[PDB]
Amino acid sequence: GVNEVPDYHEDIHTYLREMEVKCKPKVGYMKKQPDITNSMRAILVDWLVEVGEEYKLQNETLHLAVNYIDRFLSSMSVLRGKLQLVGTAAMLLASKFEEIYPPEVAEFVYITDDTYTKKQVLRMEHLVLKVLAFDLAAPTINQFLTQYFLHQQPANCKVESLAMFLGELSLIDADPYLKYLPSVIAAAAFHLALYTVTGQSWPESLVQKTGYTLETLKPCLLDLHQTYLRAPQHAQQSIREKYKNSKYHGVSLLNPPETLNV
Template structure:
């Protein structure tokens, strides 16, 4: 059995000695690490593009800052009637027991294999920790929901439970997992091009989309995995704590 173009192989195949790849790779511009420096990309989601030019939203040229901040603006999302606010499924008391039972059933179905990292020939727990730290920064950069990060980590662990990955492709797996989690959880997920950019263009759009497809296939499209955040929400509903404590736990 040979390694695929992604630097991966199925764990069910016979043992294969993969080629070694450095933890840090030089990107297309040279000298860049695999885990890109987000501090250089702070202007990515602002009005400035890569070339420093303004990219106005079509149809918004005639609006100034004050008009966008007006309370009468239909785009002001802070004005939401109480009855229109989304209610968490965990807050529906009548179905709390059924929801908890369902979460426990799905937890068994969607959990990674114990000790899967021991079967990985080219990556370590420390490399996984570096990847997760980078995903935390990505989530902060794009102001993503906490649940998005938890889902992405779940997808990564389940994928690594089934596939051997070379260290040079580990960030690609993490990027695809974060892209999938964003599509699943966020109202306005970042574009694929933005995920390519935050990797310092280590991978191109085609590679990210192909890896996304592979992750979906390996996970059998089971993306609604329970996370610790859902259990915490249930616990805090039954046992309220101070808001500071709740924020620290989440």
């Protein structure tokens, strides 16, 4: 029904496809950052996963913040001492956009363990807004996933949660995931989740909607399948912890498949 906007879902999907291209970060910004690395970014994202957990924020909020951060770091060079300030303002701006009840600024100051001042957080909020030119309605993995979910026959919560999980894992690791558009990571995540749980594959009907096939998704899928296999070993564990919770059906506890036959 209307909750799925039958009259507008195609218009909206096409528009998200256009915007994801405009909102895309520079794929190789880290090698142009003198003082920060993929590893440091991973630590930041993992931490933002914990903040969203602690403040019971929407997963959408988390995705928007990472989008803001990656875009910011594409044109602004940042000292390792200040990375967390960028992340904090990003989370704030994402929360004010996407949350019914955003945490107050002071709570954001609190989670940085008084590394920064309220004044510093609000000034980075302004800088981020300047740098992004207030373009904050960015497409996320989640906005695509939720549409892809409408193609399940029938709906399966394990599938939906697992896909969300795999999408989240991709936020952590700029190499390789900066090179994939949200819509593609989402496609990979959905197919992997579906395969893992039910044995089925990326459906015909999503080939109609998206123009993507197992062929076109294959690169991303091979990466996401590795990330899934290695996830217990990753330095960063906050997403696995989160997805043990019953809220997400404990999906981090499912066993990845050993092969995709793709």
